[PDB]
Amino acid sequence: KAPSLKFTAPFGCEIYTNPIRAENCAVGSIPLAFDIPDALFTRVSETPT
Amino acid sequence: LSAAECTLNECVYSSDFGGIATVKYSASKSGKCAVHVPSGTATLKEAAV
């Protein structure tokens, strides 16, 4: 029994059991898309300047 | 008036009255009178302030 994947995983993952899953593997990057409606854009003079 | 200065707070060339100009003046008498733009550059909302 060469040690578990809990202790040997690259990027510092955190292997768990009941769903077989890894946690918090610091690798890659998430891109994001924001479809923002036009109602949220407050005008200039309703904010300090 | 005497020594009046005009700055543009909001400026958006929208179809409605989408621009705010705050005229910083210094008046000899305190009384209402009429503002106007001679050109077709801007169309003012109110006739007097």
Q: After which residues is chain B broken (C to N over 2.5 A)?
A: none
Q: Calculate how close chain B gets to A44, using CA atoms only, in Å.
A: 6
SS3 A5: helix
- Distance, CA of B25 to CA of B45 (rounded, Å): 19
Distant-in-sequence contacts of A1-10, Cβ < 8 A, 24+ apart: none
Strands (DSSP E) found in B1-49: 5-11, 19-24
Is the separation of the CB atoms in B14 and B35 below 8 Å?
no
DSSP code at position A11 = T
Nearest to B12 by CA among A42, A34, A37: A42
Query: What token pair was written down for A38?
Result: 């036009």
d(CA B21, CA B38): 16
Q: Between vectors from CA B4 to CA B39 and to CA B12, what angle results, nearest 5°?
A: 50
DSSP type of residue A20: T
Write the DSSP symbol of residue B37: -
Residues of chain B with Cβ-Cβ distance to A44 below 8 Å are 9-10
Q: Kindly state the tokens that stand for B29.
A: 């008498």
- Resolution of this deposited model, Å: 3.5
User: Which residues of chain B lie closer than 8 angstroms to A45, CB-CB?
Assistant: 9-10, 20
